[PDB]
Point group: D2
Chain length 315, copies 4
């Protein structure tokens, strides 16, 4: 069948929500692959029944066999750790996931190269900007066929917090967070709009203040940590963000979505992956949009990339 | 039942598409009211069967009785003429619909006042900015409970044409057209974004030129005329625009949508209706957003309002 | 792009609603082909703008060129007449459309054979059971790649009328109408269920009577005539039925839908098309389900096929 | 705002998926209430961001305060244990949850009575048929305003397994499981249809055998145990089933759905809750449908009710 085959490499919390959303949207057949025995089968069985409630027809299978990557149209990688086994939630940091997740990406890359070299790849494993390039290199896929999750999620948080202060539909607030997904993420105040109107107009009208926005910015950057300390490493929004990206690709929607992508000169950077708006369609990353950042914004972008480069040196 | 009752006053081309979309979206029960005998019943019967295909449960009834407005939660007025009975399609102009549709609005207003004074009203009949105020005055409804169709439709055309040149998802282009729905509509080049990014960046990158944009602007303004000369007064997009507005109201989405609304000082105008972004939610027009227009843009806005004022004088 | 290309051969009332629904559902690119100059372009332009309201990305183009069938994944044929130019609405009969639509099918078949021999074809033009076979023969497509509209529409009417008497969700009533789409359609009382429960149980409980059901049966058979006399040849429900079929094919849903399909022994008939439940998926007509009809029901089926055979003899 | 307020009493695995699906479908505002400190806030925060990806506008709040039940339109109770703290997964049984969950229902009932006596209640906590009546009595709500989850979930499993053997859309298989949700659930072979066609026809055609169906029946009954031993107490399908019920109520769909409801003579039983098809609409349980079971099926139903009665005696 010409229905898309979507392989979720990693069947944990995010993997579970992704499978659920894929069935709700009838996006394609799903394989919940994981290193843990039987669990993926259990989740798959549970999720497969929703086809009835959703009026869909998507097969949902579990797997503990890498070769099931064969024939994959889309591969979503969440495989790895959410935190370092010994740190407290208070000291939670994506950087500490570097020595834990690196070897996993190499292993997965080799299987992708052998089994589904023409698949569209979405990397989620943290530190994402480092992990995505590691997988790009080991999988051998073209630069337009691999992206990392970052901006769609970070901006969803920023967009949401602003929409609640202004009392407008969440999707009506558009915003851009670039550079890298982590504590050095670059929140672009200048590029925020509400109903397509520059945010500064709402600031001028005393509808939202600069002080409130600064607090919203800090909350956005610290959201993962805030949720990690309240409950666990976030998974619902991450899953929804990923599926919006996967959906744009599968349905050729050509949505402008901020993702980690290979930079080849944009922002003065090359040979590294960084967050920037891209257009996702049938041909993968169809366009890499370079925001005409001012020097102050570019300095922040450089600081974000510097972090990715530091961890890429695996130190 | 607490399901919303939506009365479509006018069951012509736009009325037909609206009923179809309401059932697709399961928005509420529908009454296709019209002055023409039996036709509304025929359309209603045809449309009611789609409940099966759509997995919905919306009653769709025809009516030739004004009293069926009783209990209406939303009233959409398309009643009237699409053109003046004697003009050629080449000389098609919304202004000529003034002497034809004025009496119709007064009649409908009286029935709304008597039967459903608490309903949310959406006026479509042209010249819309004039007709909406006429209905506002005769229906007695509060200013936050009545709007006219204009900007959502005009901008859909502008957004679409730009999305095809740039190869991005149509919804990713945001744009604003204000003042009035007609030949004096104000297309705000300064307020156009793509994926939330200022359009000027795409112009700077030679992705779209100023000359191409100027051609797109003219096409947008002349779209109705272009379609009227190819086929008929547009109805599919108008219907979709109206339902997006009605849906924002019914589901309390709080979308920022450009509609004709009573101006009370915005842009230096009062006691007149004009197109401007508003927030539509459960309380109707919850916010009227005034774009901080520059003098050049304001001069264009004044020219648009001048036209509405001229026809309002019924001359 | 791998997005499906859907060619609507005939851009009239049904064609218009189909294009609208395809965009709402983001099913694929649409070509509104017609013999009438410019009209398809006008409708296409109008419909294309809805991509904005619908958050979709489907191209909608008009055409007056048969070669645009090239590359078509799905071809929906509505081309032809809705009534005979001289009969009154009171004497409206699908049989009189035979001498009007036959030549049209042959012409379209030749173009399909040359331009898109691997496309999935849905024939709507009346008398449908005759027209579908005529197109099958002239297009050269495999038997599993062509079907005619009939049962999904006829049953939607029967299902709907019963759901309103019993006060249940319309989709919860399942029913089967077979043989042919026309005055000899076979309404199978024995195969009606409500929430999967045999209808006879509701009849036993005095929730609906046999007399009421008999009236509902007559209304179902005469629905097209009833609407034709109130308004025009039905188009909204027909369009929704067609899209449900096209959607089952495109998304590999494998829905059991009653359509006109080539009979090869089922019900004792061969070399003729007749209405019967089929399973529509990625491989087209994946299964032809033969209802184990009793002799009384089979006698009615024979009467329906007899009519198709009579008109097939073009008399 | 007139948007529905949905209180999820219990914010565990099922609660999490429900909140996610409510936002996807824009069903209403959500309160994730739980006894565990901070966790509901974390899940709510995570889920609230999806409003962006889903184009919805549903508030999602966490709570550790019972009074937040005030103003609730729908209350979904999942509060309790999934297993007895000391049993192995191999010996997992819903009956052992009786001494653990009883006190919880009484406590919740008192709060519902005081805070939202007019809310529609959906009980999920196991053993569900016992728990729902316990909550009915302590909450004081009318019999038409409270139901327990059971049949929609059990049948989703049966419907699914059959659809995969027959290669048809999962929703096209309709089936009925009654009496109680547990090991004594009554699978009604006689009431199974495929595309509305009696299953026996497919058995006659050698498309599926009686032996295969018997294996599918056993798998359906043991599904929860199978998943519990592979992964954990199922939550994705349960959540989807619950939301389909809640949605039928909120949108007045009037779907026929099998749920645990107060029996007042049906099947020869009174003063006890049992699984049976009901019609869920704006007025709650609008109809209780009694299947005209034969003596053999009724004997099985009696065995199911006997179990509920035994545990109701809290022994
Ligand atoms: N890029 C972004 O914006 C975000 C990144 N993340 C990251 O996503 C990753 C996953 O998050 P969760 O799903 O919450 O974690 P989780 O721990 O729930 O799931 C990860 C799964 O990966 C599995 N795994 C380990 N090695 C495997 C391998 N070789 N192949 C397949 N599966 C394997 C584990 O058994 C586990 O089931 C983490 O690194 C997390 O930090 C989380 C949110 C957002
Ligand atoms: N505001 C905007 O953005 C747009 C405005 N329009 C306007 O919408 C109006 C309707 O357009 P269509 O649906 O294409 O026209 P149409 O001619 O197809 O339908 C109008 C219907 O109103 C009926 N009618 C007349 N008096 C009536 C009354 N007293 N009460 C109820 N029904 C009555 C007519 O019988 C007719 O069926 C026109 O004035 C058109 O110019 C069209 C597109 C966009
Ligand atoms: N099978 C079924 O269940 C149903 C069948 N019908 C039939 O569908 C057909 C179409 O119905 P409507 O859309 O309401 O009619 P319509 O008259 O609105 O549209 C038919 C279109 O076909 C065009 N046409 C004629 N020759 C053409 C050709 N060579 N190629 C392409 N286009 C050409 C006409 O110009 C016209 O625009 C009719 O025969 C009608 O009887 C209608 C409802 C249900
Ligand atoms: N009726 C049916 O068809 C099905 C029933 N179930 C039942 O649903 C229940 C919940 O299942 P899961 O969500 O997987 O369990 P879970 O353990 O993940 O979640 C239950 C939550 O209830 C909380 N809780 C305890 N007392 C509370 C109170 N007084 N008020 C509010 N929250 C409180 C717990 O802290 C926990 O977070 C279980 O009894 C399970 O057996 C599960 C599937 C289907």
């Amino acid at each position: 069948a010409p229905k898309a085959k979507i392989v979720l490499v990693g069947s944990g919390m995010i993997g579970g929500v992704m499978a659920t959303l894929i069935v709700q949207k009838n996006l394609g057949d799903v394989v919940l692959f994981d290193i843990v025995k039987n669990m993926p089968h259990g989740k798959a069985l549970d999720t497969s029944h929703t086809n009835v409630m959703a009026y869909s027809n998507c097969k949902v299978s579990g797997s503990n066999t890498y070769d099931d990557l064969a024939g994959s149209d889309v591969v979503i990688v969440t495989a790895g750790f959410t935190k370092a086994p010994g740190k407290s939630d208070k000291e939670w940091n994506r950087l500490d996931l570097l020595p834990l997740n690196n070897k996993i990406m190499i292993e997965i890359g080799g299987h992708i190269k052998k089994n589904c070299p023409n698949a569209f790849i979405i990397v989620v494993t943290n530190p994402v900007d480092v992990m995505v390039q590691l997988l790009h290199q080991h999988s051998g896929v073209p630069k337009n066929k691999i992206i990392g999750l970052g901006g769609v999620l970070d901006t969803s948080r920023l967009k949401y917090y602003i929409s609640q202060k202004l009392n407008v539909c969440p999707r009506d607030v558009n915003a851009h967070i670039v550079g890298a997904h982590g504590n050095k993420m670059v929140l672009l105040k200048r590029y925020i709009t509400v109903g397509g109107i520059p945010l500064q107009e709402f600031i001028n009208n005393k509808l939202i203040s600069d002080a409130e926005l600064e607090a919203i910015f800090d909350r956005t950057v610290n959201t993962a940590l805030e949720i990690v300390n309240l409950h666990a490493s976030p998974y619902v929004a991450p899953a929804a963000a990923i599926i919006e990206m996967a959906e744009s690709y599968l349905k050729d929607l050509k949505k402008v979505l901020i993702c980690s992508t290979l930079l080849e000169g944009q922002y003065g950077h090359s040979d590294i992956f960084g967050g920037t708006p891209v257009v996702l369609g049938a041909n993968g990353v169809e366009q890499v949009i370079e925001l005409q950042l001012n020097s102050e914004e570019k300095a922040k972008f450089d600081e974000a990339i510097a972090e990715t480069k530091r961890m890429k040196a695996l130190a």
